[PDB]
Amino acid sequence: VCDSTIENPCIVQDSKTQFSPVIRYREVASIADVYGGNITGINKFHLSGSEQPSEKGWEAIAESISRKMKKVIVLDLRQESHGYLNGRAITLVSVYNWINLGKSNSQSTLDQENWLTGLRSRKIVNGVLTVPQYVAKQYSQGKSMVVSTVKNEEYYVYKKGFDYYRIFISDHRAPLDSEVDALVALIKNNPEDTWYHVHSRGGKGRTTTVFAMFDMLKNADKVSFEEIIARQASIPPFYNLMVTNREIPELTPYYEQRLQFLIHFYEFARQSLMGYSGTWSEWKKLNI
Amino acid sequence: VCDSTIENPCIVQDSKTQFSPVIRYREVASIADVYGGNITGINKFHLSGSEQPSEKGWEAIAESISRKMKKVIVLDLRQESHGYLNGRAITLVSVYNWINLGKSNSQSTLDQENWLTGLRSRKIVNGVLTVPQYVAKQYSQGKSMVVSTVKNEEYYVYKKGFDYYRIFISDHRAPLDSEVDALVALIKNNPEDTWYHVHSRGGKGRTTTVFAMFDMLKNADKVSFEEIIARQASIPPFYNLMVTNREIPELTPYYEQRLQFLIHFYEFARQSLMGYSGTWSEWKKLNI
Ligand SMILES: O=P(O)(O)O[C@H]1[C@H](O)[C@@H](OP(=O)(O)O)[C@H](OP(=O)(O)O)[C@@H](OP(=O)(O)O)[C@H]1O
Ligand SMILES: O=P(O)(O)O[C@H]1[C@H](O)[C@@H](OP(=O)(O)O)[C@H](OP(=O)(O)O)[C@@H](OP(=O)(O)O)[C@H]1O
C-alpha cells in the first residue's frame, strides 16, 4: 500500500471513467467576448487549454480544435509521471504531486515510462485510488483493475495527428529557466498560425501561467501587466494568477514566486518586443 | 546560374540559419513506449537519428546523446555532395538530388571536397538557394553570402569527439550491395554498446531504412517483417517503409525497390541469426 511519500507513491486515477468529459476546456480568443478592458492582440490566438483529458476527452478536444480551424501541438506542462490505465488518466502522486521534483527532464521521462512499462506488464493493477480517496488518505481502499491498456499521453495525441511537446513544470510552481527557454523557443520555431492545446493536471495554475506567457510574448508592449493577468482570468475557470492564497495555504510561497516570475517575464517579453534578442536565461542573468 | 542538371547543379541551403534546431531527432529505444505490438529487442538499442543538422543542431544532438549514455559513430548515409557554409548545411543538388549517382565512393568524396575547397577559396559565394526557391525553380534568385567558413560534416563531428563513417546511399533509393556490406561490417566491427547517430538529408527514407536494417540484424528471428517495419514507423516522423506512393510520384519505382530490398535483407538477417556466416553480397548471389 502507498503512503504518498516519494518512496511509496500512490496511483491516483484522475478521470472518473474513460468517458469522462473535459470540464475546463477553453480558448483564449474568447477573452475578446467577455473581458471589458484592453483586449488588444487577443482574438487572433490559436490557443486552447484544459485539464488532463480522459480517452474520450481527447476526442472532444480534437473536434473542438477542428471546428475553430494547420499544425496542432499538444503542450503537456506536467513534470510528474502520468499516463492512462484503461483510458482513464492516472498520475503517480507523492505529497503535493512532486514525484519528479528536482530531476532532469530525461530522468522524469525515464521514471514515468519505467512506471508505465511496469503497469503494462501486469494483468491486474492494485491500489488504484480516486482523488477523493487520496485526499482522505484512504491508501488501502484502492481498487484492483484488470489491465486492458496502459498508455502514455503520446498514444492518444499521436492518434489524433497532433504533435506532442512536454514542458516539465512542477505542480503549483513557476517554470524553471530551462523550461521558459524551451517554451519561448518552441513558439519561435513554429509558424505563427500553429495551434497549441496547453494542459496541466487540473487545467488551472500551470495552464493559465503558460497562457499568460503566450500573451506577454505577443502583447507586453501594448497591454499592461495587470490587464494581461486580468484578461486571462476573465474566461472559465477564471484562474487569477494575482491570487497567492488558495485552498492549500502551505503552497502560498510557490504561488508568490510564480507571480514574481511573471512580473519578470513580462519585462523580458516587453524588452524583447522593443529590440532585445537574447534568451530568457540570458536576460535573467543580466536583469534579475 | 544553376539549372538543376548535373552539368549546372544548384547550391541549396538546407538549414534556415546556423542556429536552426533539429526537427526529426528521435531514438529507436523510444519505440518501446509508443508501439502497441511486438517490442522484443527494441529497448536496448543505442541508436538515434535526425535530418542534416545545422551547426547548432550538432550541439543539441551531442547533448541528447550524452544524456542517454561509450564510443559514438555518426553515420552519414548521403551519397550526394554536402557540407556547410557559415554553419548552415548545404547540398549540391541536381534533379532528384542525385549529383553523385553512379560514382564510386572515392569519386563522390573527391567531387564533394573539390566543391567545398572551391567555395572555401572564395570571399563571396553566389547563387545560394533555399529549398523553397529550388523547388520553385527560382534559380536566379539566390543570395550572395560573404564566406566566413566552409566546412565538411567531419569538422563538426570531430569537434564533438565522435567518429564519422559514411555510407553512400542515393537519395530516395535502397543501398547498393557494397554499402549494405559496409554497414553490416561496421556493426560487427564495433562493440555492441556503440552509439550510432544515423542521418540523411531529411531524416526520413534513408535514415529509417538503416534503422530497420539495424533492427532486422538483431531481431529478425523473433519479430515479423511487418512488425519491424511497423514499429520503426511508430515514432515521429512516423516514416513507414511500406508506403510506396509518396509526394513525388515519379519516385515510386525506387520506393518499391527499397521495400523489396528490405524483404530480402530481412531473410538474410534471419538466416544469419540461424547460422549463416557469409556477407550480404555472398548471400544475395545464392538466394536472389
Ligand atoms: O487536478 P487536481 O488533482 O484537481 O489538482 C489541481 C492541480 O494541481 C492544479 O494545478 P495544474 O492545473 O497546474 O495541474 C492546482 O492549481 P494551482 O495549485 O496552481 O492553483 C489545483 O489547485 P487549486 O487552485 O487549489 O484548485 C489542484 O487542485
Ligand atoms: O531534406 P529534403 O530537402 O526535405 O528532402 C527529403 C529527403 O530527400 C528525404 O530522404 P532522406 O531522409 O533519405 O534524405 C526524402 O525521403 P524519401 O524520398 O525516402 O521518402 C523526402 O521525401 P518525402 O518522403 O516525400 O518527404 C525529401 O523531402
Side-chain angles (χ1 to χ4, degrees):
Chain A
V1 168
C2 76
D3 63 6
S4 79
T5 66
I6 54 145
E7 291 78 25
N8 299 310
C10 300
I11 300 175
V12 182
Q13 184 179 307
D14 300 300
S15 307
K16 308 174 282 83
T17 79
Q18 70 268 52
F19 307 108
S20 295
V22 188
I23 64 179
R24 310 205 172 90
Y25 180 85
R26 70 281 199 180
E27 295 162 11
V28 167
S30 68
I31 290 167
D33 304 327
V34 290
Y35 185 58
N38 189 349
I39 58 164
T40 301
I42 270 291
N43 69 347
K44 60 70 167 189
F45 268 109
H46 305 263
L47 204 65
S48 58
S50 78
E51 82 279 12
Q52 190 67 51
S54 69
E55 174 176 27
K56 181 160 191 284
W58 286 113
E59 305 305 314
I61 287 159
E63 297 182 3
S64 295
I65 294 177
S66 70
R67 289 190 256 101
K68 207 48 186 187
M69 298 208 281
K70 276 58 158 238
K71 171 191 206 90
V72 178
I73 300 179
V74 171
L75 196 58
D76 182 3
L77 304 182
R78 304 180 62 186
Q79 180 186 59
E80 69 270 17
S81 296
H82 70 100
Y84 289 81
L85 171 60
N86 303 336
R88 301 137 166 95
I90 56 168
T91 305
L92 186 62
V93 180
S94 53
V95 298
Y96 299 127
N97 188 31
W98 288 335
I99 190 63
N100 289 336
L101 174 72
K103 303 180 184 174
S104 72
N105 298 347
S106 296
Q107 194 68 47
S108 293
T109 292
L110 178 63
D111 287 349
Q112 165 182 296
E113 297 298 342
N114 281 342
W115 172 61
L116 293 177
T117 291
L119 302 182
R120 188 177 297 121
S121 73
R122 299 176 182 260
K123 179 58 60 170
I124 301 170
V125 173
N126 300 304
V128 182
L129 308 173
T130 65
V131 170
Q133 291 177 316
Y134 174 85
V135 166
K137 295 182 127 275
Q138 308 177 314
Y139 302 131
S140 68
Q141 295 176 45
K143 70 196 160 176
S144 295
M145 289 159 92
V146 175
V147 174
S148 184
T149 63
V150 174
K151 303 293 191 188
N152 61 13
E153 173 162 329
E154 288 97 313
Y155 173 83
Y156 298 105
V157 171
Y158 292 173
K159 265 230 291 175
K160 300 290 160 256
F162 300 162
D163 291 345
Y164 175 85
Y165 197 90
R166 192 167 187 169
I167 307 290
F168 294 75
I169 306 180
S170 303
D171 203 348
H172 321 292
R173 304 202 184 195
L176 296 175
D177 296 339
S178 66
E179 304 313 290
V180 178
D181 284 349
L183 180 56
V184 177
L186 180 73
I187 297 167
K188 266 162 176 59
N189 282 330
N190 285 278
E192 240 291 340
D193 65 336
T194 303
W195 191 283
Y196 296 86
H197 184 74
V198 182
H199 75 86
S200 48
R201 188 184 186 191
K204 287 180 178 158
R206 286 174 288 189
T207 293
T208 309
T209 300
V210 169
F211 278 174
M213 291 170 71
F214 268 92
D215 202 0
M216 289 173 190
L217 286 164
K218 322 302 135 44
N219 301 306
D221 64 345
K222 36 188 147 301
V223 187
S224 75
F225 178 84
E226 286 70 24
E227 293 226 55
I228 287 181
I229 301 300
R231 73 195 194 167
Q232 294 298 331
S234 66
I235 53 171
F238 312 109
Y239 196 90
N240 182 1
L241 289 156
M242 289 293 194
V243 172
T244 55
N245 298 289
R246 307 193 66 91
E247 295 301 321
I248 305 304
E250 318 92 83
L251 296 174
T252 285
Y254 301 104
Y255 301 139
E256 292 171 341
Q257 297 169 24
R258 180 180 66 189
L259 184 60
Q260 189 68 58
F261 155 71
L262 284 164
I263 291 176
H264 297 145
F265 190 78
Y266 177 90
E267 182 67 353
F268 163 73
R270 205 190 51 103
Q271 291 186 24
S272 291
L273 290 158
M274 305 183 330
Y276 184 77
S277 62
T279 68
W280 157 257
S281 288
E282 282 159 357
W283 182 92
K284 176 174 161 172
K285 194 194 186 156
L286 308 185
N287 287 281
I288 304 286
Chain B
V1 168
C2 76
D3 63 6
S4 79
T5 66
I6 54 145
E7 291 78 25
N8 299 310
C10 300
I11 300 175
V12 182
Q13 184 179 307
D14 300 300
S15 307
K16 308 174 282 83
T17 79
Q18 70 268 52
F19 307 108
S20 295
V22 188
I23 64 179
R24 310 205 172 90
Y25 180 85
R26 70 281 199 180
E27 295 162 11
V28 167
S30 68
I31 290 167
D33 304 327
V34 290
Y35 185 58
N38 189 349
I39 58 164
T40 301
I42 270 291
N43 69 347
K44 60 70 167 189
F45 268 109
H46 305 263
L47 204 65
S48 58
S50 78
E51 82 279 12
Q52 190 67 51
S54 69
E55 174 176 27
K56 181 160 191 284
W58 286 113
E59 305 305 314
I61 287 159
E63 297 182 3
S64 295
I65 294 177
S66 70
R67 289 190 256 101
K68 207 48 186 187
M69 298 208 281
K70 276 58 158 238
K71 171 191 206 90
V72 178
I73 300 179
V74 171
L75 196 58
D76 182 3
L77 304 182
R78 304 180 62 186
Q79 180 186 59
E80 69 270 17
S81 296
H82 70 100
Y84 289 81
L85 171 60
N86 303 336
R88 301 137 166 95
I90 56 168
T91 305
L92 186 62
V93 180
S94 53
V95 298
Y96 299 127
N97 188 31
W98 288 335
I99 190 63
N100 289 336
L101 174 72
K103 303 180 184 174
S104 72
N105 298 347
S106 296
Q107 194 68 47
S108 293
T109 292
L110 178 63
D111 287 349
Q112 165 182 296
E113 297 298 342
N114 281 342
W115 172 61
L116 293 177
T117 291
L119 302 182
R120 188 177 297 121
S121 73
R122 299 176 182 260
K123 179 58 60 170
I124 301 170
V125 173
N126 300 304
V128 182
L129 308 173
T130 65
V131 170
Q133 291 177 316
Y134 174 85
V135 166
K137 295 182 127 275
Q138 308 177 314
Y139 302 131
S140 68
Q141 295 176 45
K143 70 196 160 176
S144 295
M145 289 159 92
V146 175
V147 174
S148 184
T149 63
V150 174
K151 303 293 191 188
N152 61 13
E153 173 162 329
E154 288 97 313
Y155 173 83
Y156 298 105
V157 171
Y158 292 173
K159 265 230 291 175
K160 300 290 160 256
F162 300 162
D163 291 345
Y164 175 85
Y165 197 90
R166 192 167 187 169
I167 307 290
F168 294 75
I169 306 180
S170 303
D171 203 348
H172 321 292
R173 304 202 184 195
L176 296 175
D177 296 339
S178 66
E179 304 313 290
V180 178
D181 284 349
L183 180 56
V184 177
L186 180 73
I187 297 167
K188 266 162 176 59
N189 282 330
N190 285 278
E192 240 291 340
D193 65 336
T194 303
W195 191 283
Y196 296 86
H197 184 74
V198 182
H199 75 86
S200 48
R201 188 184 186 191
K204 287 180 178 158
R206 286 174 288 189
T207 293
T208 309
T209 300
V210 169
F211 278 174
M213 291 170 71
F214 268 92
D215 202 0
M216 289 173 190
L217 286 164
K218 322 302 135 44
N219 301 306
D221 64 345
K222 36 188 147 301
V223 187
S224 75
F225 178 84
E226 286 70 24
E227 293 226 55
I228 287 181
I229 301 300
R231 73 195 194 167
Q232 294 298 331
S234 66
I235 53 171
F238 312 109
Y239 196 90
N240 182 1
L241 289 156
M242 289 293 194
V243 172
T244 55
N245 298 289
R246 307 193 66 91
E247 295 301 321
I248 305 304
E250 318 92 83
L251 296 174
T252 285
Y254 301 104
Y255 301 139
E256 292 171 341
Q257 297 169 24
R258 180 180 66 189
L259 184 60
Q260 189 68 58
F261 155 71
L262 284 164
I263 291 176
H264 297 145
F265 190 78
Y266 177 90
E267 182 67 353
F268 163 73
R270 205 190 51 103
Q271 291 186 24
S272 291
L273 290 158
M274 305 183 330
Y276 184 77
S277 62
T279 68
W280 157 257
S281 288
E282 282 159 357
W283 182 92
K284 176 174 161 172
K285 194 194 186 156
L286 308 185
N287 287 281
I288 304 286

